[PDB]
């Protein structure tokens, strides 16, 4: 009802693409993030639920629903108020194995259910009580309203409010600019110019099947496996110092190392891979604190000339990052149409924190597992820390475990060698 509506506005191109595929592929876990937290301690579910309702009121995207039927163009509608409820389930009368079964049953049905974006709050939570001070919290949300960085903001706020309610002390949260300001910014962007930026960037790129000689083609479907390792502290510090000394980021430096490795396997100096970009335009005041969907997967195309050094590559990538910033809102589908290559990239490199990791909150998160549908057969996911954390997540029906172990070995030695000689040709790095 109009009286219940706060606001209405169009979708970002990325949101619009997600709504389209979400509607067209119900039941397939598209765009669903499901986090399972094992919790030990005196979690107060009522307090957590009050905290979640402060978050609901604070960030318009949680009160947003989507309309696609009987309209010229989809719209997102912000409701003035929506009450969040945590589903509380008591499993204390079940055996351990029976508890695991009930929780896995919930998680599997949750993936299939997804969200009805025309009516549901695009976030939900179930908390299973397994014993006194023993819980599992399954937190689900849809990426059409929230990317990872924005999720981190929400987590921070949620636990700031929870802890103030627990300590029975006043609190405040700083003002936030609403997500509609990003939608307004998009209005001012020349969409054809952004398509042209990508068309020119990808001009004359010839396709690439990455690690073609290692790809198996036998077993059907995705068999998800992961290899986790850490870069030692000394190397992590030196790699971080190197990135900063070249006025770039850890993420760009990791992409640069990867480029060297890909160039060898592809026997080519023109290569591409997927990268996650923030999508937060600097000209938007306070964008870094907004909550919504900004982060995008875009192609990175790297060109290695004879003699190119690692510091040369850092400069190349850093400059391209800056040039791409106004155009990071373009969906990958539209980008890849500008190259006439629907499979232009076939793996991704992601550098990110996770705000939930395994005192203050009165309880411990003893385990955290994240489910997200996998769109590529290989994904390199790194996270900052005293030891940089690197995860190679892959489809074992395509890549052998032995090959992923070889990539780990090659990554580690390449990083070590490039730290030591960032001003020699990268062709001299032994892998």
Residue numbers in the entry: 5 to 362, 369 to 441
Please share text taken word for word from the publication where this structure appeared.
These natural products are biosynthesized by multifunctional enzymatic assembly lines, called nonribosomal peptide synthetases (NRPSs), that use dedicated modules to incorporate each building block selectively and sequentially into the peptide scaffold. The enzymatic assembly line that produces the microbial lipopeptide antibiotic surfactin, surfactin synthetase, consists of the following three proteins: trimodular SrfA-A, trimodular SrfA-B and monomodular SrfA-C. The modules are composed of several functional domains, including C, A and T domains.
However, we also solved the high-resolution structures of wild-type SrfA-C, and comparison with SrfA-CFA structures provides insight into the origins of the specificity shift. To first test whether SrfA-C has any latent activity with inherently less reactive fatty acids, we examined its ability to process 10-undecynoic acid, which contains a terminal alkyne for bioorthogonal labeling. Although activity was detected, the fatty acid was processed >15 times more slowly than O-propargyl-Tyr. We therefore prepared a large combinatorial library in which hydrophobic (Ile39, Met41, Trp143, Tyr145, Phe155 and Val159) and negatively charged (Glu37) residues lining this site were simultaneously randomized using degenerate codons that code for small and hydrophobic amino acids. Structure-based considerations would certainly have included mutation of Glu37 to a smaller residue, as the side chain of Glu37 blocks the fatty acid pocket in all crystal structures.
